[PDB]
Design an enzyme around this catalytic site. Sequence first.
Site, mmCIF file in Angstrom:
data_model
loop_
_atom_site.group_PDB
_atom_site.id
_atom_site.type_symbol
_atom_site.label_atom_id
_atom_site.label_comp_id
_atom_site.label_asym_id
_atom_site.label_seq_id
_atom_site.Cartn_x
_atom_site.Cartn_y
_atom_site.Cartn_z
ATOM 1 N N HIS A 42 8.715 -5.993 20.482
ATOM 2 C CA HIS A 42 9.559 -6.205 21.650
ATOM 3 C C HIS A 42 9.135 -5.238 22.744
ATOM 4 O O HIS A 42 9.186 -5.591 23.923
ATOM 5 C CB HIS A 42 11.057 -6.057 21.339
ATOM 6 C CG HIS A 42 11.534 -4.644 21.231
ATOM 7 N ND1 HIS A 42 11.722 -4.012 20.019
ATOM 8 C CD2 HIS A 42 11.904 -3.751 22.178
ATOM 9 C CE1 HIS A 42 12.191 -2.793 20.224
ATOM 10 N NE2 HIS A 42 12.310 -2.609 21.527
ATOM 11 N N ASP B 33 9.447 -8.520 14.741
ATOM 12 C CA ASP B 33 9.349 -7.497 15.762
ATOM 13 C C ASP B 33 8.229 -6.570 15.352
ATOM 14 O O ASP B 33 8.480 -5.495 14.809
ATOM 15 C CB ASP B 33 10.670 -6.740 15.828
ATOM 16 C CG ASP B 33 10.676 -5.686 16.883
ATOM 17 O OD1 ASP B 33 10.352 -5.997 18.042
ATOM 18 O OD2 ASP B 33 11.019 -4.542 16.548
ATOM 19 N N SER C 68 11.730 2.791 19.667
ATOM 20 C CA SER C 68 11.250 1.491 19.210
ATOM 21 C C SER C 68 9.730 1.502 19.108
ATOM 22 O O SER C 68 9.050 2.084 19.955
ATOM 23 C CB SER C 68 11.698 0.390 20.175
ATOM 24 O OG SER C 68 13.107 0.248 20.178
ATOM 25 N N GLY C 69 9.206 0.846 18.077
ATOM 26 C CA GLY C 69 7.773 0.816 17.870
ATOM 27 C C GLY C 69 7.351 2.066 17.124
ATOM 28 O O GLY C 69 6.302 2.092 16.483
HETATM 29 O O1 LIG Z 1 18.657 -3.667 22.646
HETATM 30 C C1 LIG Z 1 19.394 -2.732 22.325
HETATM 31 C C2 LIG Z 1 18.766 -1.295 22.277
HETATM 32 N N1 LIG Z 1 19.650 -0.123 22.045
HETATM 33 S S1 LIG Z 1 18.841 1.390 21.797
HETATM 34 O O2 LIG Z 1 17.813 1.579 22.919
HETATM 35 O O3 LIG Z 1 19.887 2.518 21.894
HETATM 36 C C3 LIG Z 1 18.062 1.431 20.238
HETATM 37 C C4 LIG Z 1 16.717 0.833 20.025
HETATM 38 C C5 LIG Z 1 16.065 0.861 18.743
HETATM 39 C C6 LIG Z 1 16.731 1.496 17.585
HETATM 40 C C7 LIG Z 1 16.132 1.566 16.254
HETATM 41 C C8 LIG Z 1 16.828 2.202 15.155
HETATM 42 CL CL1 LIG Z 1 16.096 2.274 13.573
HETATM 43 C C9 LIG Z 1 18.155 2.786 15.371
HETATM 44 C C10 LIG Z 1 18.794 2.751 16.640
HETATM 45 C C11 LIG Z 1 18.124 2.117 17.790
HETATM 46 C C12 LIG Z 1 18.731 2.056 19.116
HETATM 47 C C13 LIG Z 1 20.857 -0.403 21.194
HETATM 48 C C14 LIG Z 1 21.641 -1.702 21.595
HETATM 49 N N2 LIG Z 1 20.786 -2.887 21.982
HETATM 50 C C15 LIG Z 1 21.446 -4.237 22.005
HETATM 51 C C16 LIG Z 1 21.319 -5.248 20.795
HETATM 52 C C17 LIG Z 1 22.704 -5.211 20.019
HETATM 53 O O4 LIG Z 1 23.096 -3.948 19.489
HETATM 54 C C18 LIG Z 1 20.059 -4.937 19.872
HETATM 55 C C19 LIG Z 1 19.820 -5.942 18.683
HETATM 56 N N3 LIG Z 1 20.200 -7.434 18.911
HETATM 57 C C20 LIG Z 1 19.974 -8.451 17.815
HETATM 58 C C21 LIG Z 1 20.324 -9.883 17.983
HETATM 59 C C22 LIG Z 1 20.084 -10.800 16.901
HETATM 60 N N4 LIG Z 1 19.531 -10.406 15.692
HETATM 61 C C23 LIG Z 1 19.190 -9.079 15.496
HETATM 62 C C24 LIG Z 1 19.384 -8.075 16.503
HETATM 63 C C25 LIG Z 1 20.825 -7.845 20.292
HETATM 64 C C26 LIG Z 1 21.042 -6.700 21.375
#
Ligand SMILES: O=C1CN(S(=O)(=O)c2ccc3cc(Cl)ccc3c2)CCN1CC1(CO)CCN(c2ccncc2)CC1
Lengths: 235, 51
Positions: A42, A88, A185-186
């Site tokens: 992503h 991902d 991420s990544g």
């Molecule tokens: O896109 C994000 C990024 N942030 S973040 O930058 O602080 C972030 C990014 C990567 C992370 C990896 C780990 Cl291991 C732990 C915490 C993390 C927090 C959190 C909320 N969101 C919003 C989402 C919801 O919490 C992220 C995941 N999602 C789905 C949908 C369908 N299937 C799986 C996942 C939709 C939007």
Amino acid sequence: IVGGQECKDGECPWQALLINEENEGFCGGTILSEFYILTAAHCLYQAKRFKVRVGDRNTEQEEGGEAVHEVEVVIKHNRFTKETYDFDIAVLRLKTPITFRMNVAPACLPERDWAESTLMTQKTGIVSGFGRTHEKGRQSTRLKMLEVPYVDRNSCKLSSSFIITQNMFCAGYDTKQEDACQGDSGGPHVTRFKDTYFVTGIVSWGEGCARKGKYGIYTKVTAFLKWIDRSMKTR
Amino acid sequence: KLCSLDNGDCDQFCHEEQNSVVCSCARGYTLADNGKACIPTGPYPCGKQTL
Ligand SMILES: O=C1CN(S(=O)(=O)c2ccc3cc(Cl)ccc3c2)CCN1CC1(CO)CCN(c2ccncc2)CC1
Ligand SMILES: [Ca+2]
């Protein structure tokens, strides 16, 4: 990263950081070989153009061992889905070889069956980055590494608010204020076994950062092995 | 046999070739003569922390 210690000289030498035009870190990566970096798929959208910086532990006080490489070609996984973060995973190809030195070395790739039996049933795993130190804080100038213990797959599924596909796995804590966060991420998720670390996962996603009853969702590298191979021949 | 006892006494990958166990290592490595350990064939081997 929330909590965790600080990557000390030579501790997280496989970390890699993807920087944007502005030369700002915005995602992690994992050196696999001199030519290939392993990262979350992503992350390949938060920049019109980026570069992968390796060998950097503190963004500001030039350690000297840094080094910036321009991606030659980027290989994103065909079945990625912004709508669910499934598959991902991606693999970058550098135009010029990474020269291995202090705070710069490639992490090992395990064998599918072996890794799932011995590497994931382990008690904990390493995850590092330059990401936020608090759920709503700033990025980070110092490179960090956190010891995230493995999470049961069902508590995993029950705690989430979204599906946990075959290509995913939980890790971290229910209550302890420790977990990856924005900008991680990544990033690499490595497991140590006899003073040797294997790339057992790509930082994928999470619902917030260190939120109670919520975990950190990583990409299941073991599920992608053959792909990584077929990718380090470029495809 | 049994790569379960203690990873079959390998430094890395383990397999249970029909009867007993067989050890192997990651790239950049070479199985020692005892068929159990793993030896770096270069100066910056994967998995190891620079020091
Ligand atoms: O896109 C994000 C990024 N942030 S973040 O930058 O602080 C972030 C990014 C990567 C992370 C990896 C780990 Cl291991 C732990 C915490 C993390 C927090 C959190 C909320 N969101 C919003 C989402 C919801 O919490 C992220 C995941 N999602 C789905 C949908 C369908 N299937 C799986 C996942 C939709 C939007
Ligand atoms: Ca620096």
